[PDB]
UniProtKB/Swiss-Prot annotation:
Binding-site list for glutathione: K23, T24, Y25, C26, P27, Y28, Q62, V74, N87, D88
Function as written in the Swiss-Prot or TrEMBL entry: Component of the glutathione system which performs several activities such as glutathione-dependent oxidoreductase, glutathione peroxidase and glutathione S-transferase (GST) activity. The disulfide bond functions as an electron carrier in the glutathione-dependent synthesis of deoxyribonucleotides by the enzyme ribonucleotide reductase. In addition, it is also involved in reducing cytosolic protein- and non-protein-disulfides in a coupled system with glutathione reductase.
UniProt xrefs under SUPFAM superfamilies: Thioredoxin-like
Species name: Saccharomyces cerevisiae (strain ATCC 204508 / S288c)
Protein name: Glutaredoxin-1
Amino acid sequence: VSQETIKHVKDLIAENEIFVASKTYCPYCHAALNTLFEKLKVPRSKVLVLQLNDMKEGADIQAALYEINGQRTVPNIYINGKHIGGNDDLQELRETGELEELLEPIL
Ligand SMILES: *SC[C@H](NC(=O)CC[C@H](N)C(=O)O)C(=O)NCC(=O)O
């Protein structure tokens, strides 16, 4: 995986208040996106959702995200440039009452 690809993924993570790498058929991605837009009412203009399976760079992006954060699955969620993880990770922050503070500066 190229150095330039890593930098491109870093850039997209920093230029967007929430970053989700997803796949259109992944039910975990549907759960996470549903939580974000529908339950937590996060404006869509604040979220970059990349459906990697619908994109040329799909595979390079996922591999780049492994190099960056060690995660290999989707959804791969960043909030305010901070690495969240998958849907389990997102749902867990809700259950510990800790997600609310990460969303403040954003929402
Ligand atoms: S649905 C596609 C797969 N995703 C998951 O397994 C997510 C489970 C996590 N525990 C979560 O986010 O809650 C997946 O990414 N499979 C491998 C792949 O390369 O697509």
